[PDB]
């Protein structure tokens, strides 16, 4: 019996949702998304790992007034892209960068309705910024920067303290796509994992610190 879904507060017009699995080794984990606000226009910032989570999370902005436009997920794995195919079946508009949604369906999943390429892409103009720093935790990891308040969604790219599952990783590119995303968002006030708590700018300086460690080790025998 996995922990409730939870949603707080971070800043003005966004929220922090945590969803829970159970992770062999390592006991429940949470994993963190965003919820953004746009007027009267809530986006999801990857969706809990579960449909009926995903629609707890719908049902708690909608009951407030908000009218869900969008999901994007930072990355194929189930912790982003788990609530995909509840939010198709309800036709809220689904989006992944072309490769996530690659990704999706060579692991054998429910791809996202809308797709997009390139480094930059903006979900919301002036509001909700996807940015592909490299390959890392995954190929295909992006991370979604909110202008206004600065504040980062690093997904799961951002691993301060230890790089996680290696599983999918590009270890080989992950120091310089660390690199790339630290020399970018040096301004972020908030900067948000998926698997720890909330931070500052210096999440970039561990993370890339963990990155070049984790290519060390891959070297050894
Ligand atoms: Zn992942
Ligand atoms: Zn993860």
Known sequence: SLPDLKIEKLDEGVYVHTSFEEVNGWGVVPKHG?????????????????????????????????????????????????????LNSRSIPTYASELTNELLKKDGKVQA?????????????????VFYPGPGHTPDNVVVWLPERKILFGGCFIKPYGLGNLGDANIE????????LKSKYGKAKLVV?????????????????????????????
């Open 173 to 180: 590119a992950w120091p310089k796509s660390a690199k790339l």
């Open 34 to 86: 965003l919820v953004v606000l746009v007027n009267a226009e809530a986006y999801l910032i990857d969706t809990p790992f579960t449909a009926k989570d995903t629609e707890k999370l719908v049902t708690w902005f909608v009951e407030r007034g908000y009218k869900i436009k969008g999901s994007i997920s930072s990355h194929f794995h189930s912790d982003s892209t788990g609530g995909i195919e509840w």
């Open 193 to 221: 994992p998926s698997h720890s708590e909330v931070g500052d700018a210096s999440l970039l300086k561990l993370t890339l610190e963990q990155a070049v460690k984790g290519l060390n080790e891959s070297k050894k025998p």
């Open 113 to 129: 309705t809308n797709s997009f390429s390139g480094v930059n892409y903006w979900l919301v103009k002036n509001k909700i910024e």
